[PDB]
Amino acid sequence: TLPFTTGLIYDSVMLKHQCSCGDNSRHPEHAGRIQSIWSRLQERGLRSQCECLRGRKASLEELQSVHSERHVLLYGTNPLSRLKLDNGKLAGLLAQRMFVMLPCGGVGVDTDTIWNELHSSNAARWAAGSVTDLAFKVASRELKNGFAVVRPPGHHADHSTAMGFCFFNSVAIACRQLQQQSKASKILIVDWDVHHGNGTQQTFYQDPSVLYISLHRHDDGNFFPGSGAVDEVGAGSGEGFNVNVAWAGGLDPPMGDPEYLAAFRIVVMPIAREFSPDLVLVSAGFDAAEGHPAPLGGYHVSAKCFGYMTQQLMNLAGGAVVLALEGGHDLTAICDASEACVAALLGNRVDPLSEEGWKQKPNLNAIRSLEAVIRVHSKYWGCMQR
Ligand SMILES: [K+]
Ligand SMILES: [K+]
Ligand SMILES: [Zn+2]
Ligand SMILES: [Zn+2]
């Protein structure tokens, strides 16, 4: 009801992260992703309804709440910064007579993960500080929820590893920052990008204060990045607080709405309520959308299903919900998916009766995959027991 209680995060800083080969056809994590989304938000009348924010750069201190000092200095600084770094640090960055040459002749961290020598450090720090900033507002309660239209994505970047199009784990940084500023708070991270958020899982693996729930294509270790099997529940104090909805059995039958709606009904929502989070962050990749062919997906989740998933998560944590863009590169599918999530965020309700496709039962691979989730997590969660 209260107006402008929903924020949107976007800035053109983030468009500059582009290979120097100048060819979007070999580089699916391109600037077009976030720009094509931004305008969809206007043409449909949603931007006006939101507290729009530009974001800011994360400080090196914020980055270090998740990443090593060497990763941070590598990807968070520029030669030559107005930066006051001590000479030993300066010397360390000289030992890396490093870089990787891409087949296209541009610089990369690996074949897929490109580096612009002028602009990528600024764009990565900007994605991370924007999600941190959109989130702080929601935590203060100065906003109800919000949506971060950020790139590059974050959820594959681990403590000292950039990979998978990601350099800093924007969501994990926001999580840590939030927790610094509100003692004893409990944070739920829901990751619905089709790939396992290996960096997020690892950041929080031994930490009972954060519950991580990933839904991802897994298929017995044979989908990028190979990580995030169902038996990975957390370790030490954090045992039970890592939930991998690891989908097995491949692309046949089709994996789409009935499976995702079932995963929410049976696993995400009940465990989430039992955890009872102070705030919910979503790694909201749209690469499980209809529109991604075999290699980068194969799934058929729809805009409305993403909308309805957003809408259910709003029942949690007093409504404190922040989505951050992760993966997904088919432009119409990511734009449809974002719009749906954004309507949903404003207080629009989706009608589950409206879709005939949602009368279909989840396929058996899905059921099986969930049975394994259940069987594993019955040890830790009451709603999973018996
Ligand atoms: K995921
Ligand atoms: K955890
Ligand atoms: Zn290139
Ligand atoms: Zn992905």
From Swiss-Prot:
Lineage: superkingdom: Eukaryota
Modification Phosphoserine occurs at: S81
UniProt PTM comment: May be phosphorylated by CaMK1. Phosphorylated by the PKC kinases PKN1 and PKN2, impairing nuclear import.
Binding site for Zn(2+): C19, C21, H27, C104
Site positions for Contributes to catalysis: H329
Subcellular location: Nucleus; Cytoplasm
Region (Histone deacetylase): 1-351
Active site: H156
Family per similarity comment: Belongs to the histone deacetylase family. HD type 2 subfamily.
Function: Responsible for the deacetylation of lysine residues on the N-terminal part of the core histones (H2A, H2B, H3 and H4). Histone deacetylation gives a tag for epigenetic repression and plays an important role in transcriptional regulation, cell cycle progression and developmental events. Histone deacetylases act via the formation of large multiprotein complexes. Involved in muscle maturation by repressing transcription of myocyte enhancer factors such as MEF2A, MEF2B and MEF2C. During muscle differentiation, it shuttles into the cytoplasm, allowing the expression of myocyte enhancer factors.
Subunit record text: Interacts with HDAC1, HDAC2, HDAC3, HDAC4, HDAC5, NCOR1, NCOR2, SIN3A, SIN3B, RBBP4, RBBP7, MTA1L1, SAP30 and MBD3. Interacts with KAT5 and EDNRA. Interacts with the 14-3-3 protein YWHAE, MEF2A, MEF2B and MEF2C. Interacts with ZMYND15. Interacts with KDM5B. Interacts with PML. Interacts with FOXP3. Interacts with RARA.
Protein name as it appears in the record: Histone deacetylase 7
Organism: Homo sapiens (Human)
Gene: HDAC7
